[PDB]
Amino acid sequence: EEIYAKFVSQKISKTRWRPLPPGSLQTAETFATGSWDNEENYISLWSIGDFGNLDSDGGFEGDHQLLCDIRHHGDVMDLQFFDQERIVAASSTGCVTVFLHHPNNQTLSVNQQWTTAHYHTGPGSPSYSSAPCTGVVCNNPEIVTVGEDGRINLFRADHKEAVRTIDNADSSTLHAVTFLRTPEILTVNSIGQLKIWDFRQQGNEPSQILSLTGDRVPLHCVDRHPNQQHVVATGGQDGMLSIWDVRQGTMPVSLLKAHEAEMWEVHFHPSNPEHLFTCSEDGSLWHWDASISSWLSTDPAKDRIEITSLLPSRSLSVNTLDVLGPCLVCGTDAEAIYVTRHLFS
Amino acid sequence: LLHRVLVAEVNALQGMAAIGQRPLLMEEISTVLQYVVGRNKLLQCLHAKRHALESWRQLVEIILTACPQDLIQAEDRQLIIRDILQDVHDKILDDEAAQELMPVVAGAVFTL
């Protein structure tokens, strides 16, 4: 069906759905966003407007209603839900912040904050320099983050300090991070590599490394298939999409062109994961259907992936997406958000 | 359903004695269930005999009400009805004859 765009008069760097109650029969009712490149950046909670109704006096109540906000510090580099009331966000300040929604009040608050999670160092004094925190992933009650400092941190939603830190896991920027298994993560970098880390190991060095062959394509985003802990998808500086089986050598299994630019997020569908979605600095947003899991076929001219642009035009950059049941949302540099309640009609 | 219900009571009898009598209670459930299979055969037979007699009566009454009088003549049409009446009577004048048939039999004897 048609897609309900909204201007919000801030650039949106990140969007996320509110996690549904286990065993409910609701659609995705609420989403959260984070902003970037303002004089003031914010994190906001929104409801999807109800296009089903008019009352006697003819008003269009079908707007994506703002529930509540809170002001941020720096740019909102990455964003994720932690439970059904708490959210975690990264920052250009190297800060990591946990927030709490108050349904009885319609407000946000801070819940906990790590103001120096990421920082660059220098010769012999604790006059640290700000390092952008680039990505965040949650495994409640646990949390992991990456940054320009090449640091990996492990944090906890009951603890104030770091549970573990790993400085200089790269000499370049680390961009994004995901959990393969609860003590076992994967990160991506400025070189064009996937680095795998096990918090059980007492060294700081990586448990495994994967790459492209020689020429450097920085990898900006990563996801890992919901019912295959060994299948990983990454997005390049060029607009390539790479599918990996982390058990089978050092290279991707499947290599596809997705954009004419930097690909900013990639996601498998949380219930339908033979479906995939991607956004980019080429101004486009795409759906991919492929229904061995079809993502691991070495000949996409035999086995299918059938591919749809969800936007009817190209905008200023699409930084982010999220998809939950039939609902999809994306966020842009055109100071705007796009939402559908239905992706299968 | 009858087996499930009778076995539920042979679970609900919480005692000493019931749990020595349980074999005989399952054995008497077996004779009750066999009698009820007999009752189910009887009802399906009394249906089938009566449904066949109703189908036969329907055929006879079309031969009489709907076939042309120039296809069965004034004497052979009478002999056929005189003979059918005598055969339809004796099978209900015999005292083993099922009473469920009498509303079909008298219903035929009337049209005949």
Binding site: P141, R181, Q202, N227, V231, R247, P273, I292, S293, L296 | -
Partner: protein, 224 residues
């Protein structure tokens, strides 16, 4: 006695945390010659108890062999998933006798080989919900989860206690159905498979359990 000795040894090398320095190789792991011999004896045992009623009872009743407690105890240890699969099949052949099955249901719930009691501080799950997603989903072969589905597939036809899990959690079956539905079945088309057949060998043994659970259930007003 060999199974009790392996249980006694494997449960004693357990890594006490403070011991962070240069260990040697632990020369106490079962070698393949003992593994494949234990597999042959478990498969012999499983055939015998699959047939003979007398041979399920007169092994479970033995106060010095206690085979259910030794086998569930070995399933908690870091042994290979193939040896765990033939151990689970030996339980699946034992669980034909309803007296054994009723005690086995309580023993499975007590041993958390599927973790029904998830603790609010705990990040990693424990038991077969990790081994399926962190061992079998690396090998691309699924003997442990298929043997667990086969264990539940016997233990439904010998029935389950209505009070299963009481005092530790709400009573009843649905935590096992959540694993079979939401961790096995809804995840059978996602996973990769070294055996192109095993994608279907997994589907058989889960849809059998669901079929049995809908065959023998008749609706009652208390369900509502």
């Amino acid at each position: 006695h060999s199974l009790m000795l392996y249980h006694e040894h494997l449960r004693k090398d357990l890594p006490s945390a403070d011991s962070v320095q240069y260990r040697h190789l632990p020369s106490r792991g079962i070698t393949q010659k003992e593994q494949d011999g234990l597999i042959a004896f478990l498969q012999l045992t499983s055939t015998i108890i699959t047939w003979s009623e007398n041979a399920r009872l007169a092994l479970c009743e033995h106060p010095q062999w206690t085979p259910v407690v030794v086998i569930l105890g070995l399933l908690q240890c870091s042994i290979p998933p193939v040896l765990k699969a033939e151990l689970l099949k030996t339980l699946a052949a034992f669980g034909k006798s309803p007296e054994i099955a009723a005690s086995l249901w309580q023993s499975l719930e007590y041993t958390q080989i599927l973790q029904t009691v998830r603790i609010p501080s705990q990040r990693q799950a424990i038991g077969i919900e990790v081994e399926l997603n962190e061992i079998e989903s690396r090998c691309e072969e699924y003997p442990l989860t298929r043997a667990f589905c086969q264990l539940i597939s016997t233990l439904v036809e010998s029935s389950f206690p209505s009070n299963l899990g009481a005092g530790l959690r709400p009573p009843g079956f649905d935590p096992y159905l959540q694993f079979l539905r939401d961790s096995v079945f809804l995840r059978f088309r996602t996973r990769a498979y070294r055996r192109a057949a095993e994608k279907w060998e997994v589907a058989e043994v889960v849809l059998e359990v669901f079929y049995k659970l809908l065959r023998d259930y008749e609706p009652q007003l208390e369900d509502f």
